[PDB]
Design a protein that fits this description.
CATH class: Mainly Beta
Order of helices and strands: EHEEEEEHHEHEEEEHHEHEEEEHHH
Assembly: monomeric
Name: Lysine-specific demethylase 4D
PDB class: oxidoreductase
Number of strands: 16
Bound molecules: N-oxalylglycine, magnesium ion, nickel (II) ion, zinc ion
Entry title: PanDDA analysis group deposition -- Crystal Structure of JMJD2D after initial refinement with no ligand modelled (structure 39)
Number of helices: 10
Keywords: PanDDA, SGC - Diamond I04-1 fragment screening, Jmj domain, epigenetics, oxidoreductase
Strand content: 25-35%
Radius of gyration: 19 Å
CATH superfamily: Cupin
Number of domains: 1
Strand order of the largest sheet: 1-2-14-10-16-8-7-4-5-12
Structural class: alpha+beta
CATH architecture: Sandwich
Distance between the termini: 44 Å
Largest sheet: 10 strands, mixed
Length: 331
């Protein structure tokens, strides 16, 4: 078995190898990359996502989210308070202010320490889930707005034809902005490209050990657990590496820098934070191997996680028994 310790793998495709996206994903899996839950892909040196970022300040963040924490430094929840709209120019200036900027630090490790020690005491502002793309339409390789769609994968593998579309989303981050522990909707893959700015640190649990993280989460957030049988779908819970190590949960960590891709694999729990002002683009995708994960994916039926138009159809076709009760939570 390849990659039996479930380490995060890092790939350096040549420009020739960067032409066929599906084939490269299948290559990485042949090397065991999926066992980690997360892989890094460094694009060929000749490749670019676009020519410059010189005119991005006019993008609107219509609903910036202030991430307010509750709990203790290693075990907390966050709630997202909606703020008034601001442009990416305004947001970048805010990120660079004395109140919000990255503190002095020695290296990524000292910064990681400062994040876990100090995150709960602050409320950084995240511009998340903004529909759109920063890939130039002329970028032909690994353009996250030109991937094969999940609906088309389901049609090719299963013969069924369903409604729905699959488009990318932008994320504008600042120091301390946080993504809580989660898997993707319907335990899909995701791909995330860091277009610009400061790094993003990731934590991940191997898919084969995801249920260990779930059991710890039920112990650490016991009222949330009683409220919903899949409460990590709410994307509000944080657990530090120190707490994971104390509880024996297998995980790995890696820092993504500007110009790098990350891929998350089906049922790979992940969480992380941003080091400073940055912009990432991400989208879900599927392969044939995903289908069985989609059929088994948990769902939030308490109604908090409240998910997309396109996820309806996935549920309807892959989880017809759940269909019914799940759409009761989504209506
Ligand atoms: O970048 C972020 O804030 C969160 N992104 C992801 O969880 C992802 O790409 O799957
Ligand atoms: Mg602009
Ligand atoms: Ni994710
Ligand atoms: Zn729920």
């Amino acid at each position: 078995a390849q990659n039996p310790n479930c380490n995060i793998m890092i790939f350096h495709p040549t420009k020739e190898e960067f032409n066929d996206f599906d084939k490269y994903i299948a290559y990485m899996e042949s090397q065991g990359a999926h066992r980690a839950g997360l892989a890094k892909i460094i694009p060929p040196k000749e490749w670019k996502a676009r020519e410059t970022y010189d005119n991005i300040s006019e993008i609107l963040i219509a609903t910036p989210l202030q991430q307010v924490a509750s709990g203790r430094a290693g075990v907390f929840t966050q709630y997202h308070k909606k703020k008034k709209a601001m442009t990416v120019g305004e947001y970048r200036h805010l990120a660079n202010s004395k109140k919000y900027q990255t503190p002095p630090h020695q290296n990524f490790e000292d910064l990681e320490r400062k994040y876990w020690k100090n995150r709960i005491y602050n409320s950084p502002i995240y511009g998340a889930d903004i529909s759109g793309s920063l890939f130039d339409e002329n970028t032909k390789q690994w353009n996250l707005g030109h991937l094969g769609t999940i609906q088309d994968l389901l049609e090719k593998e299963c013969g069924v034809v369903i409604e729905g579309v699959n488009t990318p989303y932008l994320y504008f981050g600042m120091w301390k902005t946080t993504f809580a522990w989660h898997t993707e909707d319907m335990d899909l893959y995701s791909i995330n490209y860091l277009h610009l700015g400061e790094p993003k640190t990731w934590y991940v649990v191997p898919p084969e050990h995801g249920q260990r993280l779930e059991r710890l989460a039920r112990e650490l957030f016991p009222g949330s657990s009683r409220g919903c049988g899949a409460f990590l779908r709410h994307k509000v819970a944080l657990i530090s590496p120190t707490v994971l190590k104390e509880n024996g949960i297998p995980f790995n960590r890696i820092t993504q820098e500007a110009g790098e891709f990350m891929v998350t694999f089906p049922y790979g729990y992940h969480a992380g934070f941003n080091h400073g002002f940055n912009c990432a683009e991400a989208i879900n995708f599927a392969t044939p191997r995903w289908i069985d994960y989609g059929k088994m994916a948990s769902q939030c039926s308490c109604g908090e996680a409240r998910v997309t138009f396109s996820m309806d159809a996935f549920v309807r076709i892959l989880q017809p028994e759940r269909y019914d009760l799940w759409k009761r939570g989504q209506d």
